[PDB]
Amino acid sequence: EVQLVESGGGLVKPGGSLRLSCAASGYTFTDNYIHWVRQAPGKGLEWIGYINPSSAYAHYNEKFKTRFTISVDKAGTCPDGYTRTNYYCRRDGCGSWCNGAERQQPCIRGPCCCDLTYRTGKNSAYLQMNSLRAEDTAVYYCTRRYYSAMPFAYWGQGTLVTVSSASTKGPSVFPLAPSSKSTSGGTAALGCLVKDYFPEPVTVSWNSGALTSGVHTFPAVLQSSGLYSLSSVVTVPSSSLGTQTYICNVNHKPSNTKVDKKVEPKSC
Amino acid sequence: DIQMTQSPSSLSASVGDRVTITCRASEDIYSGLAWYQQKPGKVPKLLIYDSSTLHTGVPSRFSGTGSGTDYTLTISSLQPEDVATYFCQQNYDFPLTFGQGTKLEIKRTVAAPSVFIFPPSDEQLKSGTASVVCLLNNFYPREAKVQWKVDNALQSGNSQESVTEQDSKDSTYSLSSTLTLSKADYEKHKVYACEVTHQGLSSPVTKSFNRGEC
Ligand SMILES: [Cl-]
Ligand SMILES: [Cl-]
Ligand SMILES: [Cl-]
Ligand SMILES: [Cl-]
Ligand SMILES: [Cl-]
């Protein structure tokens, strides 16, 4: 499948720099432009720029030209039966001259000279951003058109960039234990309180993903301390509370904090 | 730049209904307009391009019309899984620019919350802080009032609330409210109560616990 897989996002202090990456696979890398788009909380999507990996030409939204740079890996491969030279390729058993960029650019069928190419696999574009400020906090996407003259149809998953002076902090995970008054033969609720972390995001699953029905994981709230907190709950049969095990799997990758929290009725 | 203005900012409609979202460009974009659907945490999905052409996999109850500066996305036979933000994007001109989005809610029948209160854990109390949590589960409409009371004193300014995305199948919401107190204050009081007002409840409902009770 066509995939764009982003990485590199995280916390950065005002004035700092950060390079994000978009690893593209599943199609000829030079066939399509890679664009960068961002989405700040509330604000609508904002187009940043694109790069054409065939030519490495980049075009920017004026708003970002001073601070942001879009790039791609350098290509360094010559097809089978070709040998690399200074900056292009040479066909084995050819020697005649080749007219500069004109004849060292596209690889016509099987010429005497052909441009350096990417290997199939993952090839990456990048977004370098410096002099970041608070209003650059956002989810940053890479994306490409379905085809020339068609809109963005393939999107990277998004990577969060947080521009703040606050320090990284891992969460504490506390039980929301099922009530001793839970209705006999009825429905009980329990959960996990994921408290005091920074920056976003945290993810929560239950029973390593085996438990999905009845789960609600709430949006985080930013507390007056400048730290986030959120809750995840699930409703289950009251009768299962003595037997079935319930574990919330919390992952705060920004602090390298993974926690499995067993949640059970409190003893007296 | 071409500024895209989307209207309304939100709308609410029943399953089977027909709704329209409008996008207006600050200049003629000659039908170079795309529509996307996006759910929270998920990537945009391309619905329509060239103002009226449906993309692969998109049901035909989505339809785009318009010309000049003024375009419309129409969703017929609204379905519960259509809860999402919808936005337009012009492709006529760089810089590419997007509308600000329209959030879509499904109107269903009133459903009262089930309410649950949770005391602070002993592990947290070692930290010097106490969090009390009130859960309102699977209710509609979204409007709901939570009042915290500690030995019959109303608490104000020391709680925060969060609401889930409207459920894509049953069209309900759920809500968490967290009351935060010092451990010292928690230990000086006995009765902790969450009182919930909601259209589906005939009268407000209170869930309470006594500190230290098993
Ligand atoms: Cl393209
Ligand atoms: Cl700043
Ligand atoms: Cl700083
Ligand atoms: Cl989060
Ligand atoms: Cl279009």
Author numbering:
A (entry chain A): 1 to 268
B (entry chain B): 1 to 214
The authors write:
FabT-aHSA crystallized in the space group P21 21 21 with a single copy in the asymmetric unit. Superposition of the CDRs of FabT-aHSA onto those of FabT resulted in Cα root mean squared deviation (RMSD) of 0.54 Å. These structural data confirmed that insertion of the knob domain into Framework III had little or no impact on the structure of the Fab. In contrast, K74, A75 and K76 underwent large movements of 4.8 Å, 4.4 Å and 6 Å for the Cα atoms, respectively. K74-T77 and L116-K122 (the latter equivalent to K76) form a short, twisted stalk which is stabilized by multiple hydrogen bonds. At the core of the globular domain, there are 3 three consecutive cysteine residues, C112, C113 and C114, that form disulfide bonds with C94, C98 and C107, respectively. The knob domain occupied a solvent channel and exhibited high local B-factors, relative to the rest of the structure.
By this route, neutralisation of the canonical antigen (TNFα) was retained but extended pharmacokinetics in-vivo were achieved through albumin binding.
